[PDB]
Each structure stands twice: as C-alpha cells, then as structure tokens.
Amino acid sequence: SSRVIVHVDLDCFYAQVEMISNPELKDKPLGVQQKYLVVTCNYEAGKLGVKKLMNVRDAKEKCPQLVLVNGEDLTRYREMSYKVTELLEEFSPVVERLGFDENFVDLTEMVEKRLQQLQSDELSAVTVSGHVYNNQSINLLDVLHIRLLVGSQIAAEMREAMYNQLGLTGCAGVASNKLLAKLVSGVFKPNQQTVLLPESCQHLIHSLNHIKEIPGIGYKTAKCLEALGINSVRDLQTFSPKILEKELGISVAQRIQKLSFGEDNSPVILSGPPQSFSEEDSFKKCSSEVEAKNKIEELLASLLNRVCQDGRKPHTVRLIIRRYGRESRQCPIPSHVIQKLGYDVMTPMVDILMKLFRNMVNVKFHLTLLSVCFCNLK
DNA sequence: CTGGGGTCCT
DNA sequence: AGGACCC
Numbered sequence: 001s002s003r004v005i006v007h008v009d010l011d012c013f014y015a016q017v018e019m020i021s022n023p024e025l026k027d028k029p030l031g032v033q034q035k036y037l038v039v040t041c042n043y044e045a046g047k048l049g050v051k052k053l054m055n056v057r058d059a060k061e062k063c064p065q066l067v068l069v070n071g072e073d074l075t076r077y078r079e080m081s082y083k084v085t086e087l088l089e090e091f092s093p094v095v096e097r098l099g100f101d102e103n104f105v106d107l108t109e110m111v112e113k114r115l116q117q118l119q120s121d122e123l124s125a126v127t128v129s130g131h132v133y134n135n136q137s138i139n140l141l142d143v144l145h146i147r148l149l150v151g152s153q154i155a156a157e158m159r160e161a162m163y164n165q166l167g168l169t170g171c172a173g174v175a176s177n178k179l180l181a182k183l184v185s186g187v188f189k190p191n192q193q194t195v196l197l198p199e200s201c202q203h204l205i206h207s208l209n210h211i212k213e214i215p216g217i218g219y220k221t222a223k224c225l226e227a228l229g230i231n232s233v234r235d236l237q238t239f240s241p242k243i244l245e246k247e248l249g250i251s252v253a254q255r256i257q258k259l260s261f262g263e264d265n266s267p268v269i270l271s272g273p274p275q276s277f278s279e280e281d282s283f284k285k286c287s288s289e290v291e292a293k294n295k296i297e298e299l300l301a302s303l304l305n306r307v308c309q310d311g312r313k314p315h316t317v318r319l320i321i322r323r324y325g326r327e328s329r330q331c332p333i334p335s336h337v338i339q340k341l342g343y344d345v346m347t348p349m350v351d352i353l354m355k356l357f358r359n360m361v362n363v364k365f366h367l368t369l370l371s372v373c374f375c376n377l378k
Numbered sequence: 379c380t381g382g383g384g385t386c387c388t
Numbered sequence: 389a390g391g392a393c394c395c
C-alpha cells in the first residue's frame with residue numbers, strides 16, 4: 001500500500017509571471033515588491049545576493065542595479081496558479097494546493113496502470129527522469145523503485161507540459177508521502193526534479209539543520225521545542241514521547257514526532273475551488289473612520305468582481321484589523337443581497353462592515369492593517 | 379522598512 | 389474569535 005506522490009513547486013513564481021508579462025525584464029535582475037518587502041526575485045538578482053523576503057533597502061544595497069515591480073495585486077498570480085493546478089488535474093483528478101505555487105498529486109493509480117500496460121522485456125528498460133537523491137543505486141527488481149521511476153517519468157511529463165502550455169518552469173519531487181515529496185522537490189533548483197528511493201529517507205531527514213525546516217513545525221512549535229533542548233531532527237526522533245505530549249498536547253506531539261522520521265500518512269486532498277476570498281491592505285497609519293471607510297470600499301469592489309466571476313455566493317463576511325495582534329468580526333450576508341450578486345450591493349455591505357468596524361474600534365485610533373474576507377461559499 | 383494571501387483546528 | 393500552520 002505504498003503510494004507515489006509528486007510535489008511541484010514553481011521557480012520564483014511571481015517573478016516568473018512578471019517576466020512573462022514583460023520579457024524585457026528577463027535579462028535584468030528582477031525583484032517583486034510588496035510595500036517594504038522584496039517577496040521574490042529572479043535567478044539573476046539571486047546571484048547578486050538578493051534573497052526572498054529581503055528588505056527593499058537591504059536588497060537595493062546588495063543590488064543597486066536591481067529593478068523592482070509591484071506585486072501587491074495577486075490577480076495575475078492567482079490566474080496562473082489555477083491554470084497550473086487545472087493542468088495537473090488533467091493528469092490525475094486528485095490535486096492538492098499549497099500556497100499559490102505548490103501542488104501535490106497522488107500518482108499511485110496512474111503509475112499502476114502504466115506498469116500494467118508494460119511487458120517484462122520493457123521492465124528492465126525503465127529509467128529515471130531527473131536526479132536520484134543521494135546518487136542512490138536503482139534496483140530494477142525492487143517494485144517500489146520501479147513505481148517511483150514511473151512517477152519520475154510522469155513528473156517530467158508534467159513539467160514539460162507546464163512549459164509547453166503555460167511557459168512556466170518548476171521543480172518536482174517524487175516520493176512515497178507528501179512530506180518526503182515536498183522535502184525532496186527542492187534539492188535541485190531550479191527547473192529540475194529529484195526522486196527519493198526509500199533507502200535514502202533517513203539521509204534526507206537528517207540533511208536538515210533546523211526542526212522548523214520540517215513542514216508542519218512552525219514558529220511557535222519550534223521555539224517551544226528549543227526551550228526543551230530539542231534542536232536537531234535526531235533530538236526530536238529520540239526525545240521522550242510523554243514529555244512533548246505534555247508540552248504540545250497529544251496530537252501535535254505524536255504527529256510531529258512521526259514527521260521527524262519521515263512518516264506522513266496524510267492523504268492528498270482534492271483542493272477544488274477556493275474556500276474563501278479575501279483582500280488586505282497595510283499602511284503606516286489609519287486614524288480616520290472616513291479613510292477606513294474608503295479603504296474598505298476599495299477592498300469591497302475588487303472582492304465583488306472576484307466573487308461575481310466565480311459563480312458561487314459567499315454566505316459570511318469578515319473584517320480584520322491590526323492594532324498599533326489581529327482582531328476580526330464576521331457575520332452572515334443577508335439572503336436579500338446574497339441572491340442579488342452581480343443592484344447596488346455595495347452600500348449595504350459598507351453599512352455592515354462599518355457596523356462590525358465600530359464593534360472593533362471606537363470612533364469617539366491607530367490601525368495598521370485592514371482586510372476583508374468572503375467565507376462560507378456555496 | 380514585515381506582504382498578501384490561503385487551510386484547518388480549538 | 390482566535391490560533392496554529394502553509395506559501
């Protein structure tokens with residue numbers, strides 16, 4: 001019952017899209033900027049020392065010749081992302097989205113059909129596509145090895161189809177679960193793929209230097225674990241189950257300790273259509289209810305176009321604010337306005353979000369972030 | 379000089 | 389409503 005999973009991660013996604021829009025940007029060192037942050041950059045700027053999530057001032061110091069493009073509008077990135085996901089859904093219907101640029105696909109059924117169409121004389125002719133992690137030797141008599149190789153071939157066909165149909169490049173990783181497929185996809189970058197045979201799992205899991213490098217272990221869990229002297233993957237592997245059960249609860253403890261061994265039983269979930277739409281806007285300061293009302297109007301209009309095109313009606317609205325630490329107030333959308341989506345649906349919505357806003361803050365302040373979300377879609 | 383999004387769990 | 393995680 002050993003699965004074959006592929007994880008696809010796009011190379012400098014936003015930068016890649018911006019280079020497609022304006023091929024002029026292809027040669028020069030490019031960075032995509034949101035407010036004071038260079039959120040991603042092309043390979044050239046990366047050679048010049050620019051790194052992801054670097055300060056615009058630090059990136060400009062490291063690279064004064066750097067050219068920046070504003071990427072605070074995720075419209076193009078969202079379109080392209082869902083094009084990638086749909087194309088992968090053409091291979092296997094079960095595709096899971098992670099962020100805008102990552103996709104898990106379960107290739108087990110497909111690999112099975114491909115193998116069952118083959119003849120024994122062709123079984124020795126099975127070859128890997130792309131890198132093999134750790135230069136490990138392929139045993140063509142190992143059925144798991146064969147299935148993983150076929151998975152590598154399917155991954156290659158996926159990347160080639162992404163390039164020929166969408167002009168996008170990315171990295172792929174083929175493994176037996178989602179954690180390992182994601183961990184091995186980034187070994188060779190960019191525009192390469194790597195397959196992980198089982199015998200090398202531990203090697204991969206011990207190539208990490210920080211426990212936060214494990215997907216599923218974030219900032220709070222990492223700092224917490226550090227407070228107990230757990231700093232390496234082997235520390236977490238060998239640590240006492242009961243203590244971290246006490247420190248993190250039973251669920252977090254068991255699951256992340258299983259992750260420390262490369263074990264991940266979670267299935268690939270069909271993402272399908274989005275569960276929510278939302279838009280944000282940060283600022284140095286917000287102190288006027290009129291300006292807050294105007295920003296909320298700006299978010300509302302774009303959200304209305306986005307939801308109108310989707311063809312599903314949201315049944316909950318929420319407002320999020322950040323103080324001088326985030327707070328939110330939501331409520332159902334009236335069926336009167338819900339049914340008539342696409343009339344001046346604006347004015348009542350502004351009234352609703354302004355009432356929630358008053359619940360949050362007293363007009364009778366310093367806000368640094370305003371966000372609006374349509375949730376509970378149908 | 380720290381964005382703009384998403385998911386699921388409690 | 390908030391908090392954990394992901395990009």
Ligand SMILES: Nc1ccn([C@H]2C[C@H](O)[C@@H](COP(=O)(O)NP(=O)(O)OP(=O)(O)O)O2)c(=O)n1
Pocket residue numbers: 009010011012013014015039040041052053099100101190381382395
């Ligand atoms: N914290 C983050 C992480 C990613 N992103 C956006 C910018 C990225 O272009 C896109 C993909 O994220 P990413 O895979 O973490 N880095 P990117 O794809 O740019 O480069 P690679 O390292 O994957 O080649 O999401 C963001 O806006 N905020």
Ligand SMILES: [Mg+2]
Pocket residue numbers: 009010011012013101
């Ligand atoms: Mg990427």
